[PDB]
PDB file of C-alpha atoms and ligand atoms in Angstrom:
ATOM      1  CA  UNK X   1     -32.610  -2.298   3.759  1.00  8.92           C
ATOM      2  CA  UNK X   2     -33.702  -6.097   3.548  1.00 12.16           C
ATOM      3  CA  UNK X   3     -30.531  -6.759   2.389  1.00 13.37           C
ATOM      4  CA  UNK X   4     -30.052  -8.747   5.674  1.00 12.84           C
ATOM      5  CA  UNK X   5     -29.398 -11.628   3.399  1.00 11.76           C
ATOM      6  CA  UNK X   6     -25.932 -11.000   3.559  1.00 12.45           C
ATOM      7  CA  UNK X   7     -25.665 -11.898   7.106  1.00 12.83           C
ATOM      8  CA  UNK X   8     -28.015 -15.103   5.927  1.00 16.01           C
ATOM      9  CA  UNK X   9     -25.147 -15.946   3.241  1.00 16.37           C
ATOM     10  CA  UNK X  10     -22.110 -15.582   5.115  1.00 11.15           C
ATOM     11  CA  UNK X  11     -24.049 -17.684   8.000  1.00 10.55           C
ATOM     12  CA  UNK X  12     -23.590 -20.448   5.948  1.00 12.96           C
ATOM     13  CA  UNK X  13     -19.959 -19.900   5.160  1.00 13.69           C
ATOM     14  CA  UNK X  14     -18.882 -19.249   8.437  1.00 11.73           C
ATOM     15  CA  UNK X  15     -21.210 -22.351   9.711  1.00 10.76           C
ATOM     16  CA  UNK X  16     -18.897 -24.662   7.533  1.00 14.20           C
ATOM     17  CA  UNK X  17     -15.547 -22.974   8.160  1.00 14.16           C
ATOM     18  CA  UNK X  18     -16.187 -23.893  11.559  1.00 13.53           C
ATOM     19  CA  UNK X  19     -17.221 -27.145  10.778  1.00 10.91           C
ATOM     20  CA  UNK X  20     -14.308 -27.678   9.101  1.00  6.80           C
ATOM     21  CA  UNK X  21     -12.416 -26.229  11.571  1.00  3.68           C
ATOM     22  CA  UNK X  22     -13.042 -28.441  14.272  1.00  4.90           C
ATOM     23  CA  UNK X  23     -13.042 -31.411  12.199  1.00  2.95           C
ATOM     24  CA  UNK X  24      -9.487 -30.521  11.565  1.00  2.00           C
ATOM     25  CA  UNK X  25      -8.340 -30.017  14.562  1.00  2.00           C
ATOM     26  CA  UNK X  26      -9.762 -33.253  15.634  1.00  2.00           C
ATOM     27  CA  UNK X  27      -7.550 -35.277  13.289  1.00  2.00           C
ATOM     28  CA  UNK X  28      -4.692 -33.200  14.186  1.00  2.00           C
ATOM     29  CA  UNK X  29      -4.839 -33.869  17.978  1.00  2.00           C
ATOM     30  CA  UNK X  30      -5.506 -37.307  17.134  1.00  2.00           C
ATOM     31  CA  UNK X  31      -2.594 -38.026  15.626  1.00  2.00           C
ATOM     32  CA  UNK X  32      -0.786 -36.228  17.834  1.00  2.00           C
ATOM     33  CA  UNK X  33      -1.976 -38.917  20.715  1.00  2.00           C
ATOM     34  CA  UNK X  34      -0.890 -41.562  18.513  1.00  2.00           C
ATOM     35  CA  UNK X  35       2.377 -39.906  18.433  1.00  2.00           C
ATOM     36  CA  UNK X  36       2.592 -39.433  21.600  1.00  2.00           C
ATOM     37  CA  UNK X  37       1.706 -42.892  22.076  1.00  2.00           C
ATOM     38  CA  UNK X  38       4.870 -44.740  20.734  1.00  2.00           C
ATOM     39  CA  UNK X  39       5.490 -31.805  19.276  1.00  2.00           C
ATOM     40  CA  UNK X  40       5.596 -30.920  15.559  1.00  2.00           C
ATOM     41  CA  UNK X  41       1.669 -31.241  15.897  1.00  2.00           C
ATOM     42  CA  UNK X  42       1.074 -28.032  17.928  1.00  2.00           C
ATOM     43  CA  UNK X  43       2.609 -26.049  15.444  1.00  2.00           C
ATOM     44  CA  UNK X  44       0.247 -27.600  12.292  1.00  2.00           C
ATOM     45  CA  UNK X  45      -2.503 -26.847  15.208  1.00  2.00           C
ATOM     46  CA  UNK X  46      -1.722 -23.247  15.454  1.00  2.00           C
ATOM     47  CA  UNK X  47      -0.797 -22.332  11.693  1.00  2.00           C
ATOM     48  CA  UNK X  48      -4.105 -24.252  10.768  1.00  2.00           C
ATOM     49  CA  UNK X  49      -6.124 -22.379  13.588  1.00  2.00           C
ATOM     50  CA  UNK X  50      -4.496 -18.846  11.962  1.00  2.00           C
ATOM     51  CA  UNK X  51      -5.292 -19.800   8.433  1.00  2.00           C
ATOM     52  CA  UNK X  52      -9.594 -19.284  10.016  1.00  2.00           C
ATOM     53  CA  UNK X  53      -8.345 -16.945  12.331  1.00  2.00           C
ATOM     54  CA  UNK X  54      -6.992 -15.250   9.281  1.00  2.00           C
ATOM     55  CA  UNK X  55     -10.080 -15.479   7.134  1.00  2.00           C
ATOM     56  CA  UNK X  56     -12.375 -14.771  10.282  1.00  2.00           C
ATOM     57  CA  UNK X  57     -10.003 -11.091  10.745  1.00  2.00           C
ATOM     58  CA  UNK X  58     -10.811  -9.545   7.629  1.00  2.00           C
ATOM     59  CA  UNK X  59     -14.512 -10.810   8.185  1.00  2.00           C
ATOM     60  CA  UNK X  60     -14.300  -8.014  11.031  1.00  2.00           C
ATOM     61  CA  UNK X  61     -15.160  -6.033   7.998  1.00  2.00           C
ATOM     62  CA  UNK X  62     -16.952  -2.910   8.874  1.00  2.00           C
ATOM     63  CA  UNK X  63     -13.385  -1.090   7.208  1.00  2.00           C
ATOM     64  CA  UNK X  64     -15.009   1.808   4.775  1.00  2.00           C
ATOM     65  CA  UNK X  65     -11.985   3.231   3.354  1.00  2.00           C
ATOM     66  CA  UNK X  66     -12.199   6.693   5.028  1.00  2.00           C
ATOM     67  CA  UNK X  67     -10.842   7.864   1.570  1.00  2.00           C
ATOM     68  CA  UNK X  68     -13.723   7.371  -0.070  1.00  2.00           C
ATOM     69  CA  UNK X  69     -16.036   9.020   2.230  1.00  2.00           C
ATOM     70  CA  UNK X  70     -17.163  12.331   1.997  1.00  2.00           C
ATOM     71  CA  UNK X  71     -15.465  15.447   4.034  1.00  2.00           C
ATOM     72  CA  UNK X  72     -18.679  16.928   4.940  1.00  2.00           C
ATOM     73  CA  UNK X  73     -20.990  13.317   5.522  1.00  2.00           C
ATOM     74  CA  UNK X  74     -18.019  11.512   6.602  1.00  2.00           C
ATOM     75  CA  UNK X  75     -19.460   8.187   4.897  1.00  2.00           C
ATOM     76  CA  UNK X  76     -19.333   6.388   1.692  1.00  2.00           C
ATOM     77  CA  UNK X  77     -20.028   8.766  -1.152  1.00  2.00           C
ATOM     78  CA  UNK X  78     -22.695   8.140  -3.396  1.00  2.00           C
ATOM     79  CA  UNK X  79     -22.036  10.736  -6.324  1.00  2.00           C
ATOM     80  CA  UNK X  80     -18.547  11.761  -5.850  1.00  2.00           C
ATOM     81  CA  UNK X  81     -17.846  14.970  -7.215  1.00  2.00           C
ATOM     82  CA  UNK X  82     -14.342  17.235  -7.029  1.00  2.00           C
ATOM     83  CA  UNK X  83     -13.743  21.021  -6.608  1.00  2.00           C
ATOM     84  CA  UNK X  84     -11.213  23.021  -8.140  1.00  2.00           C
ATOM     85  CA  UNK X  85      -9.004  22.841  -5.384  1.00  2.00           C
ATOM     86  CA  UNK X  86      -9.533  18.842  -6.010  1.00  2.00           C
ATOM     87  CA  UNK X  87     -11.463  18.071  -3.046  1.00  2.00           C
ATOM     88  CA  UNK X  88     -14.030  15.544  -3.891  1.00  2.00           C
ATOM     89  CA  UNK X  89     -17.196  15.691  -1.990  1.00  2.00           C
ATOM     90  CA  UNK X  90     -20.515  13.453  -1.734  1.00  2.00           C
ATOM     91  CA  UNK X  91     -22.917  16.097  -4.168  1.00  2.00           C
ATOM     92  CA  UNK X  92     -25.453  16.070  -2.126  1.00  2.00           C
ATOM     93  CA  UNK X  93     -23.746  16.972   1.031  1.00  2.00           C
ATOM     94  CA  UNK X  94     -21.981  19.610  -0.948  1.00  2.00           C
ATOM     95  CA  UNK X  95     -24.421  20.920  -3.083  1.00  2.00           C
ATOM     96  CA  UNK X  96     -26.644  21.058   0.380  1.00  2.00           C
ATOM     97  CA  UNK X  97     -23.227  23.356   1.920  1.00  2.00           C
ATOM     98  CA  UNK X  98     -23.080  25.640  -1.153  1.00  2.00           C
ATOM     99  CA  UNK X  99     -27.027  26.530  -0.605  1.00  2.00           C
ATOM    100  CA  UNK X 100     -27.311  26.357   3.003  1.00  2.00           C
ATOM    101  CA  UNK X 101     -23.290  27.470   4.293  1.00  2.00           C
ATOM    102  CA  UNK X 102     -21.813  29.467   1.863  1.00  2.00           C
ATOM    103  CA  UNK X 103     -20.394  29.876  -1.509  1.00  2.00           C
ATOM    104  CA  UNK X 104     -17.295  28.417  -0.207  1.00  2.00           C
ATOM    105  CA  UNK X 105     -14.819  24.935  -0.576  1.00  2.00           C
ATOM    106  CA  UNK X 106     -15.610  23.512   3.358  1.00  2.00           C
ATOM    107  CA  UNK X 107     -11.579  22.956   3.502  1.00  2.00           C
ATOM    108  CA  UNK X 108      -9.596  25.381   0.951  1.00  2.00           C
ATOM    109  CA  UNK X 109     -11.985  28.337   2.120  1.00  2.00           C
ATOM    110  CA  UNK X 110     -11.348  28.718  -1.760  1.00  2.00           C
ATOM    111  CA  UNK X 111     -14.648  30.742  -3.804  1.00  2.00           C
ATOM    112  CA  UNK X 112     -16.980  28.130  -4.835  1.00  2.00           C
ATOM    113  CA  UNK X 113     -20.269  27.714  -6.184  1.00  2.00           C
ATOM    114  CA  UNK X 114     -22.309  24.516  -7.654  1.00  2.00           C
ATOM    115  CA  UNK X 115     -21.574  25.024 -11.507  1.00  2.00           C
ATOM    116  CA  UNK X 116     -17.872  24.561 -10.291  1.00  2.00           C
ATOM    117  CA  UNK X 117     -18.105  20.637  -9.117  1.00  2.00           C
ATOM    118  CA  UNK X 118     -16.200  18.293 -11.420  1.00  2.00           C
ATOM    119  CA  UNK X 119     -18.316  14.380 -11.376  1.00  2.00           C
ATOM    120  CA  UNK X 120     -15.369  12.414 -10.356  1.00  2.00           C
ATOM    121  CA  UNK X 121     -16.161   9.723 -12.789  1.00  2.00           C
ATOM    122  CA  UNK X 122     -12.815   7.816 -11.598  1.00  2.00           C
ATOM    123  CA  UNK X 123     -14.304   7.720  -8.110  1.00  2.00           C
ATOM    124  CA  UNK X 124     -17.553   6.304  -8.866  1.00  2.00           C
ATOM    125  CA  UNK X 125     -16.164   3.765 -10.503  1.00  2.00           C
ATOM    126  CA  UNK X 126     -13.949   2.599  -7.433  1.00  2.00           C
ATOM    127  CA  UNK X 127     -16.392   2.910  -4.885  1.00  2.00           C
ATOM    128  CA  UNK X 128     -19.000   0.995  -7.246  1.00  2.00           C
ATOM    129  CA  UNK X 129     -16.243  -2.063  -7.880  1.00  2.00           C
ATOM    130  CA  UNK X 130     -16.108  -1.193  -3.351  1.00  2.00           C
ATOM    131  CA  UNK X 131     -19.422  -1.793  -3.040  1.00  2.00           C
ATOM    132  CA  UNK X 132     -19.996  -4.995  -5.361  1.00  2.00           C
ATOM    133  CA  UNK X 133     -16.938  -6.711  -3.921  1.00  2.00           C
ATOM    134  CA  UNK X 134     -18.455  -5.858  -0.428  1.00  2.00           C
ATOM    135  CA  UNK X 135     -22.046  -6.710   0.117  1.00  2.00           C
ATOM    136  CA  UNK X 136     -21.781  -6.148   3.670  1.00  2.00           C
ATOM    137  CA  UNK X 137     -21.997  -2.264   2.522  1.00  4.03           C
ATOM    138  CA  UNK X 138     -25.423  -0.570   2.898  1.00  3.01           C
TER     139      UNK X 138
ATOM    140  CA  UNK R   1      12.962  -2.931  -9.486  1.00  2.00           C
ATOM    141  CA  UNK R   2      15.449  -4.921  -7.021  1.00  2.00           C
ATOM    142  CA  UNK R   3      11.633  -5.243  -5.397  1.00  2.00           C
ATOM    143  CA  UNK R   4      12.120  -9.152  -5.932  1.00  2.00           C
ATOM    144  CA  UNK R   5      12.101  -9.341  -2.401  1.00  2.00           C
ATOM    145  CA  UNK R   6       8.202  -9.778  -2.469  1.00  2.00           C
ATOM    146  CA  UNK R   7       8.449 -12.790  -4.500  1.00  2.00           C
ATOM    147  CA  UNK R   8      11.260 -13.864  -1.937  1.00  2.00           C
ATOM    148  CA  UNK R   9       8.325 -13.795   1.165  1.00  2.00           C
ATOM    149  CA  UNK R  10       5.380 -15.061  -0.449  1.00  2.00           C
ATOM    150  CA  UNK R  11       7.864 -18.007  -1.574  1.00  2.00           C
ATOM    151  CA  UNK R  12       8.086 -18.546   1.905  1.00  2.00           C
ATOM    152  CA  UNK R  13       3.869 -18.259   2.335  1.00  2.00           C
ATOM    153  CA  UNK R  14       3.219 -20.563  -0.073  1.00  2.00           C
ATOM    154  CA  UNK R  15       6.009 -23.043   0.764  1.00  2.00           C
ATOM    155  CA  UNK R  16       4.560 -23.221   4.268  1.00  2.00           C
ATOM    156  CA  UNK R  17       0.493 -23.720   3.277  1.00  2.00           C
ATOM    157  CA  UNK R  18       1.496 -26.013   0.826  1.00  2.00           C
ATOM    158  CA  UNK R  19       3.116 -28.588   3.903  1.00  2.00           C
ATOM    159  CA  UNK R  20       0.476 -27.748   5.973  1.00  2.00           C
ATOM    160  CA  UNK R  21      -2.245 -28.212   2.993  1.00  2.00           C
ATOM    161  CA  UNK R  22      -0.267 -32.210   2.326  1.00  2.00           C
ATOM    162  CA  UNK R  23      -0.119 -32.621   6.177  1.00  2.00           C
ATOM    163  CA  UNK R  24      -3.649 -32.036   6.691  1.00  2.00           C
ATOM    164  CA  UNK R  25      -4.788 -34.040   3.285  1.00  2.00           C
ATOM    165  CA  UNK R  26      -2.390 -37.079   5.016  1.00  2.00           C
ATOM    166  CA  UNK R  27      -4.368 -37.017   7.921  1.00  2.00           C
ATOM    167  CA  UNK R  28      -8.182 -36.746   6.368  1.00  2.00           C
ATOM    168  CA  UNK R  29      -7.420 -39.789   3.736  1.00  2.00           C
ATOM    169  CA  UNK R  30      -5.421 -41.959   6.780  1.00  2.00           C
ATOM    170  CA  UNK R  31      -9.089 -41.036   8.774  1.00  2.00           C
ATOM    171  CA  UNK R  32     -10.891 -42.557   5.715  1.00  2.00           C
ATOM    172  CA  UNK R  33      -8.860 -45.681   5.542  1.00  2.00           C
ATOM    173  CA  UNK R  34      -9.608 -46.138   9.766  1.00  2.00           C
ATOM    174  CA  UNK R  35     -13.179 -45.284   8.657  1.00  2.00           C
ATOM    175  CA  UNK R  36     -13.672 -47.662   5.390  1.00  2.00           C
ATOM    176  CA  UNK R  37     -11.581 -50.123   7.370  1.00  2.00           C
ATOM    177  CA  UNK R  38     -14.664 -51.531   9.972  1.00  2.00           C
ATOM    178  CA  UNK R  39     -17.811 -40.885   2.412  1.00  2.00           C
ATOM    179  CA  UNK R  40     -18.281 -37.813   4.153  1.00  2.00           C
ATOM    180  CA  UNK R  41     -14.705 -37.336   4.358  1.00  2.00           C
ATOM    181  CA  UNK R  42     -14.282 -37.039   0.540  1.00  2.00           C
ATOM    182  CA  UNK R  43     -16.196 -33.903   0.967  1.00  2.00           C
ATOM    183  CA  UNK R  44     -14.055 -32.578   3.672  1.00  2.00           C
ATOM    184  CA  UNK R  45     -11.335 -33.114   1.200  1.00  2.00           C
ATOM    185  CA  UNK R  46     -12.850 -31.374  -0.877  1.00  2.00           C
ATOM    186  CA  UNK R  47     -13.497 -28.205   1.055  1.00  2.00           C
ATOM    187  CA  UNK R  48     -10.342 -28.566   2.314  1.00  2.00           C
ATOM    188  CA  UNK R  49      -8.772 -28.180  -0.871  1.00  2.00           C
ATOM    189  CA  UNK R  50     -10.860 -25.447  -1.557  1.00  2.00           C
ATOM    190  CA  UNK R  51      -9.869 -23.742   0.913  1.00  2.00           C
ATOM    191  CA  UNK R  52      -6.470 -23.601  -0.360  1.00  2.00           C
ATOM    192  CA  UNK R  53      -7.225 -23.496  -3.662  1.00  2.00           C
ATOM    193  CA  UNK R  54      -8.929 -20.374  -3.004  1.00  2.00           C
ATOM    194  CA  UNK R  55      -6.183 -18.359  -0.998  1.00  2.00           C
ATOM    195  CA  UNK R  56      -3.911 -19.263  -4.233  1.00  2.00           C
ATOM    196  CA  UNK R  57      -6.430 -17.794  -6.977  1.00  2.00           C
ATOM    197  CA  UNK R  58      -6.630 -14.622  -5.073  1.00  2.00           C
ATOM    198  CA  UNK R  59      -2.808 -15.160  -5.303  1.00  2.00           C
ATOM    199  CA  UNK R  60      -3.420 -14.769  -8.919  1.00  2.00           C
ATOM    200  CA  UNK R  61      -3.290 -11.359  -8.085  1.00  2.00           C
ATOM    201  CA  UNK R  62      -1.860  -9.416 -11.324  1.00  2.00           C
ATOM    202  CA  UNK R  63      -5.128  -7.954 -11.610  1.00  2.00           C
ATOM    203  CA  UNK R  64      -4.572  -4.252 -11.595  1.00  2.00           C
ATOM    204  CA  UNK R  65      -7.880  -2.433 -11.400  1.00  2.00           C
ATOM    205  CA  UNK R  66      -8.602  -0.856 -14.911  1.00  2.00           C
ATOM    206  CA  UNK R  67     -10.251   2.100 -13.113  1.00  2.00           C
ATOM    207  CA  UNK R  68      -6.759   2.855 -11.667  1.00  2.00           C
ATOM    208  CA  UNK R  69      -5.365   2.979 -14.982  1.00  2.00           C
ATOM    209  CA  UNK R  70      -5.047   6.139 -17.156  1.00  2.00           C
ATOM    210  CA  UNK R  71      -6.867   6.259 -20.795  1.00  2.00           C
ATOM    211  CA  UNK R  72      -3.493   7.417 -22.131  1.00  2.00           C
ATOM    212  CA  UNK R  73      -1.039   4.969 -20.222  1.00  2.00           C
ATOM    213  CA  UNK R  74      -3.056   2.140 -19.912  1.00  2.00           C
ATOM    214  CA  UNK R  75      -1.916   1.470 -16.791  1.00  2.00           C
ATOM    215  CA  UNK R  76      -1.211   2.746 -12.795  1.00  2.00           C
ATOM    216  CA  UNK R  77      -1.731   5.674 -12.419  1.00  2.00           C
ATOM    217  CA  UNK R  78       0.930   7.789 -10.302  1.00  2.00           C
ATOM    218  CA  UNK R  79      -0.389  11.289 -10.433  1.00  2.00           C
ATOM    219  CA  UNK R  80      -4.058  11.255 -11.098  1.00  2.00           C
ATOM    220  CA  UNK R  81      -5.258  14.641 -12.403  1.00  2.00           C
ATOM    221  CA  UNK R  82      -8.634  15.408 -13.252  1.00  2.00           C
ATOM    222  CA  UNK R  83     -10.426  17.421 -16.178  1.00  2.00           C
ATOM    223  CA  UNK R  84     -13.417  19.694 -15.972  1.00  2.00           C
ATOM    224  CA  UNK R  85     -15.107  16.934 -18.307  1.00  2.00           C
ATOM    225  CA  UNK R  86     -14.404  14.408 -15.290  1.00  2.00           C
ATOM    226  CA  UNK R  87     -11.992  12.700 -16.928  1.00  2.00           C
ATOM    227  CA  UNK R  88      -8.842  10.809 -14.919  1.00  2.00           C
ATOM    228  CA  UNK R  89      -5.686  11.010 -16.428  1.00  2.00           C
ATOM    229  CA  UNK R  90      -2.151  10.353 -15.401  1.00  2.00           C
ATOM    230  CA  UNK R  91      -0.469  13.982 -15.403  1.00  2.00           C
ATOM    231  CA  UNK R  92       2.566  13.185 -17.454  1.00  2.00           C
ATOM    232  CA  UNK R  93       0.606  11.172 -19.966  1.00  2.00           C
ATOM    233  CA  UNK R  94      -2.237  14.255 -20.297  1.00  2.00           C
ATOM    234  CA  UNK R  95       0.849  16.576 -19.947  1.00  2.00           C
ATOM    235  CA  UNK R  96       2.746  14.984 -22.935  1.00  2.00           C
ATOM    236  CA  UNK R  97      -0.959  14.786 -24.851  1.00  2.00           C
ATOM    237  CA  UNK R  98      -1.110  18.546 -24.565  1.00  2.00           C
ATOM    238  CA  UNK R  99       1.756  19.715 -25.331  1.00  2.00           C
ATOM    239  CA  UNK R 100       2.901  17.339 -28.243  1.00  2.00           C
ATOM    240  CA  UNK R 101      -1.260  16.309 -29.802  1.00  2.00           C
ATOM    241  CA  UNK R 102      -3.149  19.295 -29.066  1.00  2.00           C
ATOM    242  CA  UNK R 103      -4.884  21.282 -26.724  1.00  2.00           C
ATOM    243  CA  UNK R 104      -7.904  18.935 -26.237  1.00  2.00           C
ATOM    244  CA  UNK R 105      -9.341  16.248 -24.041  1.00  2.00           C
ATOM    245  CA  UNK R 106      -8.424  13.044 -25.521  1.00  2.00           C
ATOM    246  CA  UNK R 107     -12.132  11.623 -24.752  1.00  2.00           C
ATOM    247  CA  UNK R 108     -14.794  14.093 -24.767  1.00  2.00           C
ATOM    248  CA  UNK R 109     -12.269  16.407 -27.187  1.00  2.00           C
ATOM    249  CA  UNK R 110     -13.297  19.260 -24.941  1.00  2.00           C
ATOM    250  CA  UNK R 111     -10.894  22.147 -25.541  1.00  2.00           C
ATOM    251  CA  UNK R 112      -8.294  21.654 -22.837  1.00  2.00           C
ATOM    252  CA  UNK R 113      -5.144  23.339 -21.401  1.00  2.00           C
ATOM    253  CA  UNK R 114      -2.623  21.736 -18.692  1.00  2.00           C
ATOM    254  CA  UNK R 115      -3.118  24.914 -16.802  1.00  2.00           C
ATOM    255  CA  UNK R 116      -7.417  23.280 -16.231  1.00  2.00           C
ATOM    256  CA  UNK R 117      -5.867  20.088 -14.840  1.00  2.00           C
ATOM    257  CA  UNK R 118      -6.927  19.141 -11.218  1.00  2.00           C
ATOM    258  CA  UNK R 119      -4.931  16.686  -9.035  1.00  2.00           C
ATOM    259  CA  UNK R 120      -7.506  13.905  -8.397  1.00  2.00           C
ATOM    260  CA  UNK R 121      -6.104  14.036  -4.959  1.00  2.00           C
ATOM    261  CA  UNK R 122      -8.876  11.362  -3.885  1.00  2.00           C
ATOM    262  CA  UNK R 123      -8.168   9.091  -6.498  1.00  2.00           C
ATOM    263  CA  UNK R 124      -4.262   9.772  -5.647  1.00  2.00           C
ATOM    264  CA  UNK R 125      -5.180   8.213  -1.677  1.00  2.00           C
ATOM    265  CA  UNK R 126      -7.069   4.882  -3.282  1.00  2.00           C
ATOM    266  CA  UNK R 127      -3.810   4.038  -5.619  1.00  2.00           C
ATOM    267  CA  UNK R 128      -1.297   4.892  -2.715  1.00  2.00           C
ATOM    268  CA  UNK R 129      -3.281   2.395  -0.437  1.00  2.00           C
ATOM    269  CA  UNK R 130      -3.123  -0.265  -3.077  1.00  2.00           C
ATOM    270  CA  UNK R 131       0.202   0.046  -3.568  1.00  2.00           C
ATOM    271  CA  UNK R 132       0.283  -0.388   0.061  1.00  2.00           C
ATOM    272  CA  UNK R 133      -1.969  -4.033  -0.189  1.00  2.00           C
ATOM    273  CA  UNK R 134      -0.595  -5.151  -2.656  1.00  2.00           C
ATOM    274  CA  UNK R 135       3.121  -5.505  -2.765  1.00  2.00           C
ATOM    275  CA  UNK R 136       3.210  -7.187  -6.255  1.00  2.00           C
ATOM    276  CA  UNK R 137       2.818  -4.101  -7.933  1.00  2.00           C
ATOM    277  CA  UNK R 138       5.789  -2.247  -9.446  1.00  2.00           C
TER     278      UNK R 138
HETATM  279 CL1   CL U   1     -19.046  15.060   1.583  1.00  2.00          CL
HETATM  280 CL1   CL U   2      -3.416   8.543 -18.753  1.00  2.00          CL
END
């Protein structure tokens, strides 16, 4: 929603990463003209560019675990719950297949009906620790 | 086991960011003496250090999700198997519970028999995949 204020945060962070990026580079190259002057340089110039480029790569974000979305939303699950055949499904989504599809597990085929659905407590949990550790979720 | 061999590349890691982390100090203080010799770079310092710092209390690591862990084992789960009260347990721990304690679910006591056990096969996909992202385990 208005949680835009992650982008807001993270624009400050990445602001003075690059800040201190540059600033870095700068003394490197420096000294590397004062060596020259009178290389070992380009290769603290490269390992310190990948140590931003590094923390810049897993900025690319966007990575939901596909393992912890649903079969049948195919996104994050909010109240993972598993079928007998241990299938875990958003409930929603699967509650909405059992009334509206059939009486049916969408990928053993297996009998099922809503009384059958297990909360997969374990599940929540992860994808709740997911979701605080990430606030670029939602 | 003879899995040493992770401690054997990050020794490597570290070894490297700790030259580059001196290097790049060297040249921010040197900048400072040039600078204080005709400050903002004590905060670049700073950050810099950080920076480090921070990639090294990640490195911490050790921190095996609790939610991973079965409420028998107390620990990594490595077949996670479900109950119909939603509970997560590893299936030689609950296996062992059943057949040597009693035929009852060790948190919500719910009668229980290993033949109402579900493989958590969700749960099973998050552990594999940080086992996978994190070599220090095992
Ligand atoms: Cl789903
Ligand atoms: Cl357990």
């Amino acid at each position: 929603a208005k949680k835009k204020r992650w982008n807001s945060i993270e624009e400050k962070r990445i602001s003075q990463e690059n800040e201190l990026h540059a600033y870095l580079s700068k003394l490197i190259l420096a000294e590397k003209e004062r060596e020259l002057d009178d290389s070992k340089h380009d290769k603290y110039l490269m390992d310190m560019d990948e140590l931003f480029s590094q923390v810049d790569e897993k900025r690319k974000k966007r990575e939901i675990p596909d393992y912890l979305c649903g079969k049948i939303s195919f996104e994050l699950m909010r109240e993972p719950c598993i079928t007998p055949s241990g299938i875990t499904y958003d409930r929603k989504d699967i509650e909405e297949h059992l009334q509206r599809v059939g009486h049916f597990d969408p990928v053993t085929r297996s009998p099922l009906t809503q009384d059958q659905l297990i909360p997969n407590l374990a599940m929540k949990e992860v994808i709740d620790a997911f979701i605080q550790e990430n606030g670029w979720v939602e």
